[PDB]
Structure 1
Amino acid sequence: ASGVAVSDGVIKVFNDMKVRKSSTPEEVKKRKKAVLFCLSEDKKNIILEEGKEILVGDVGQTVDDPYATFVKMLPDKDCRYALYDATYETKESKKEDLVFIFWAPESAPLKSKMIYASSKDAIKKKLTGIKHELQANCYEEVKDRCTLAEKLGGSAVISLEGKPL
């Protein structure tokens, strides 16, 4: 426990991303498909990484595969916290669930890996309702679609983001 707090901006974004309110399709296009969390400059609060996010409206027009693009914004030599809204279909239901992703590559500096790992259990407790966790320590554990599909429902998942595995 490093004592790093979660900023009010992160809580509001997760609260909006968790529950869906009845809204016009223009506002539905503004829903966040993925978003990245990073440490502040003073390393005191967990804040939103500006510009590194995917909107629901962006999917299908500019972004072909939301997961393929989501992996790309992950830095190669830095640790990040990710919130990916996964849309997958198993053998008997179509599911839409939140996935909290801990990106800690081996190439990341030692100080970054230590703080992110030590404060992960503190931020995860503030983001109540998340039933899915993905801890990736290298690019090969996060780029493959079957890796998320294996975590979400194991072999029961037959489709991910509208595309068969």
Structure 2
Amino acid sequence: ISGIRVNDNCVTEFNNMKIRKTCGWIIFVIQNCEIIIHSKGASTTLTELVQSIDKNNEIQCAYVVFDAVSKIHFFMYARESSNSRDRMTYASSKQAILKKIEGVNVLTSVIESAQDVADL
């Protein structure tokens, strides 16, 4: 028992996005011991999405899905200035969220800023 659960809404809205077949994204965070949706939207570019996240210092870590229609990509975000305990929490809960969105292209490395995606 992790003490962290996935809110069913994460899966509802991920499926919404998947079935819509348009370029979109969802950001998930952990709040009060559950993984919930922080925000969701239509995409411009993956780099602009991560730039927006970089600008919000309240997002220290997150899970991000980016639906590019051809494929849906998943990564863990954690800013350089994020604390090690927070990062461990997210890393450790990563598999829990992935169980409900199996089929995504996972990036194994933690993304720390928009720079990291700006090439790939």
Is TM-score (shorter-chain normalized) higher than 0.5?
Answer: yes
Counterpart AA for 2:8: D
Report SS of the residue matched to 1:38: strand
User: Structure 2 stretches of 5 or more lacking a match?
Assistant: none
Q: Supply the distance in 2 between the matched residues of 1:36 and 1:122 (Cα, whole angstroms).
A: 15
Q: Supply the distance in 2 between the matched residues of 1:127 and 1:4 (Cα, whole angstroms).
A: 17
Matched with 2:41 is: 54
Among all aligned residue pairs of Structure 1 and Structure 2, give the percentage whose two residues are the same amino acid: 30
- When residues 32 and 2 of structure 1 are mapped into structure 2, their CA distance, relative to the original with a 3 A threshold, is farther
Matched with 1:133 is: 106
Q: 1:16-39: per-residue Cα shift (whole Å, max 9, x none)?
A: 12234xxxxxxx8xx661110011
Residue 34 (structure 2) aligned to one of 14, 34, 45: 45
Q: 1:57-98: per-residue Cα shift (whole Å, max 9, x none)?
A: xxxxxxxx42232112224560011010125xxxxxxxx110
User: Structure 1 stretches of 5 or more lacking a match?
Assistant: 21-27, 57-64, 88-95, 148-165
Matched with 1:6 is: 6
Greater RCO structure (CA 8 Å; 6+ sep): 2
Q: Supply the distance in 2 between the matched residues of 1:35 and 1:118 (Cα, whole angstroms).
A: 20
Q: Which runs of 4+ in 1 moved over 6 A?
A: none
Residue 69 (structure 1) aligned to one of 34, 40, 48: 48
Normalization by structure 1: what TM-score?
0.60
Mapped contact 1:106–1:137 kept (Cα < 8 A): no
Q: 1:116-162: per-residue Cα shift (whole Å, max 9, x none)?
A: 011101211121222x01233422323x1x31xxxxxxxxxxxxxxx
Please provide the CA RMSD for this pair: 2.3
Larger radius of gyration: 1
